Amino acid sequence: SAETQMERKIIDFLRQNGKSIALTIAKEIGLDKSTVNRHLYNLQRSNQVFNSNEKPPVWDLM
Amino acid sequence: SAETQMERKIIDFLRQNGKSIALTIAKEIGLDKSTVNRHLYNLQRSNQVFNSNEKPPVWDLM
DNA sequence: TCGCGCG
DNA sequence: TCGCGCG
Ligand SMILES: [Mn+2]
Ligand SMILES: [Mn+2]
């Protein structure tokens, strides 16, 4: 699905750029912050990423 | 302002109907839930309403 | 001590 | 144990 494909792009972004906050990932994938966050939290449910518990949270690959 | 006027309508709604959750107020004022909540929390800052700490919160007049 | 992803 | 108002 297109959501899966968007998630793949987010994973590629983190692989290429290292740990990142949502606002940065959103600017590069070119999606609004809420949409990026929807994907980041699904990716966390699916054990592909984790967040740092900072505010703002820092995201990276599992 | 129009925001003030919207807030007045929400207050009138609570005066006429008694304590209410946001979803109910939204349906009657005919505004989306987020907009109603924006107003309810401003009205709380301005000491005109309070919420019950229930989930969903129940709102009423101070 | 805004974290918010919420369907 | 969705509370979400967020500018
Ligand atoms: Mn908080
Ligand atoms: Mn909670």
Residue numbers in the entry:
A (entry chain A), B (entry chain A): 2 to 63
Quote the study that presented this structure, word for word:
Since these orthologs contain two left-handed deoxyribonucleic acid (Z-DNA) binding domains (ZBDs) instead of dsRBD of PKR, they were named as protein kinases containing ZBDs (PKZ). Therefore, PKZ is a functional ortholog of PKR but it recognizes Z-DNA instead of dsRNA. However, PKZ works as an innate immune sensor by recognizing poly-d(GC) as Z-DNA and turning off general translation machinery by phosphorylating eukaryotic translation initiation factor 2α (eIF2α).
To understand the difference in the B-to-Z transition rates of Zα domains in relation to their Z-DNA binding modes, we determined the crystal structure of caZαPKZ in complex with dsdT(dCdG)3 oligonucleotide at 1.7-Å resolution with R factor of 17.2% and Rfree of 22.6%. By the C2 symmetry operation, two caZαPKZ molecules bound to both sides of the Z-DNA in a head-to-tail orientation were generated. The overall structure of caZαPKZ is well conserved with three β strands and three α helices, like other members of the Zα family. Interestingly, one manganese ion is coordinated with the backbone phosphate (P0), N7 of guanine 2 (G2) and four water molecules with an octahedral coordination geometry. The interaction between caZαPKZ and Z-DNA is mediated by five residues in the α3 core and four residues in the β-wing. Among them, Lys34, Asn38 and Arg39 in the α3 core form direct or water-mediated hydrogen bonds with backbone phosphates of Z-DNA, as observed in the hZαADAR1 structure. Tyr42, which is known as the most critical residue for Z-DNA binding by forming the CH−π stacking with the guanine 4 (G4), is conserved in structural and sequential aspects. Due to the shorter length and lack of positive charge, Ser35 does not form ionic interactions, but does have hydrogen bonding with the P3 phosphate.
